[PDB]
Each structure stands twice: as structure tokens, then as C-alpha cells.
Design a protein around this ligand. Structure first.
Ligand SMILES: Nc1ncnc2[nH]cnc12
Length: 210
């Protein structure tokens, strides 16, 4: 029931402020970037399992689920990948985000655009193109289940998660901005997945709603 609050490193705070406040119409790349992250996490537990099959005792299925919820105005990306320890979460969700931001902003001045964010290892933060808040629920074999959350503004929280047990993996819950609800529509998500993620090597299931 204890919540810890952390400050973002200055460079990540600046990155998030850039993504939040730059005029950039091609916001759909956020989903490509989150699906790519999930794919990398699934590769990692698969790789670990090749020499230690017990790594899959927490779940043998390796997949990515996309879950829109119009009532909550949320779009959730679920994977059964390696997941993240508490230390991984605090360390910028397993990324080298300080140095990657630096490389990304230097690329932006030399004629790169925001869609190239994933080449600098910080594509997670493109979530803020379309979300006002992001909640990440995660479970790694070596640690307990945790919830990370941030509405930008310079800080994030970490707490033990009491929700439904996940087994192993990561859920990225996007609390969408009011003018970005097109990403809850079935036909729009399908369009984006077919365009940017057609060759991902894991089944991607787009859930539907009542
Ligand atoms: N889906 C994911 N799995 C593991 N680490 C991550 N860091 C960011 N997204 C992640």
C-alpha cells in the first residue's frame, strides 16, 4: 500500500516535455514503438528459456494483445515478455534513456523527425504523443508485480500492484487525451498495425468491445 515517488532525470523530463508540446501530426507511430518494445521483451524471455526452460513456468504463451476500452478511454498493450524488475522500472523502464535522449535531440537538430525516436532506444516515451497518463504493470520472474505511473510533470510513482496477477510480462495502459480517441476504434488500430507491424514475429490480437 506504500507508494514511492521519483523525479525523472532532467534529460527525460525534457524529452517528455518535447513530445507533449511539439506540433507533430504523425502520432500513430506510438503504437509501432510500443509493439516493438513488447517484441523485444518476448525475444528476451525466449532467449533465456533456450538454456533454462523453467523460465517459462510463469507462462509458455508468447504474444501481444491490444485492448481498447472506450468507457475508460484507455488503450492497453499487453505482452508476456521478460517483464521488468523494480530496479528496471526505476531505471527508465529498462532503457538507457539519458544517453538516448541526448542522441535523439542531436538527431532532431541534424534533420531527423520524431518518428525516428525508436532508433535511439526511447520509443516508450512516444506514448505521450497520445496519452495524458501512462500506467505500466509489470512482472519479472525475479521480482514481485509492480505498477509504475506518470502524467509527466517531472515525476513518476512505483508501488506494489495488488491487481489481477499477470504471471509474467508487461501491460502499458494509455490514458488517452480527449482529442486522441481515434486510437480506440477497431478499424484505426488494424490500419496502424497492418502498416507498421505486419512482420512482428508474435501473434498480435486486437480485442473487441461490447
Ligand atoms: N514491454 C516492455 N517489456 C519490458 N521492458 C520494457 N520497457 C519498456 N517497455 C517494456
Amino acid at each position: 500500500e506504500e507508494v514511492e515517488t521519483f523525479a525523472f532525470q532532467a534529460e527525460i523530463a525534457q524529452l517528455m516535455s518535447l513530445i507533449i508540446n511539439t506540433f507533430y501530426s504523425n502520432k500513430e507511430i506510438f503504437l509501432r514503438e510500443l509493439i516493438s518494445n513488447s517484441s523485444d521483451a518476448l525475444d528476451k524471455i525466449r532467449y533465456e528459456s533456450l538454456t533454462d526452460p523453467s523460465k517459462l513456468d510463469s507462462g509458455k504463451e508468447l504474444h501481444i494483445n491490444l485492448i481498447p476500452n472506450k468507457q475508460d478511454r484507455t488503450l492497453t498493450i499487453v505482452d508476456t515478455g521478460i517483464g521488468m524488475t523494480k530496479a528496471d522500472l526505476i531505471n527508465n523502464l529498462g532503457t538507457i534513456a539519458k544517453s538516448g535522449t541526448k542522441a535523439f535531440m542531436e538527431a532532431l537538430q541534424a534533420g531527423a523527425d520524431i518518428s525516428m525516436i525508436g532508433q535511439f532506444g526511447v520509443g516508450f516515451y512516444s506514448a505521450y504523443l497520445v496519452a495524458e497518463k501512462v500506467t505500466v504493470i509489470t512482472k519479472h520472474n525475479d521480482d514481485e508485480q509492480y505498477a509504475w505511473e506518470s502524467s509527466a510533470g517531472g515525476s513518476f510513482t512505483v508501488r506494489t500492484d495488488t491487481g489481477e496477477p499477470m504471471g509474467r510480462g508487461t501491460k502499458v495502459i494509455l490514458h488517452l487525451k480527449e482529442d486522441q480517441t481515434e486510437y480506440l476504434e477497431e478499424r484505426r488500430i488494424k490500419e496502424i498495425v497492418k502498416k507498421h507491424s505486419q512482420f512482428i514475429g508474435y501473434p498480435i490480437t486486437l480485442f473487441v468491445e461490447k
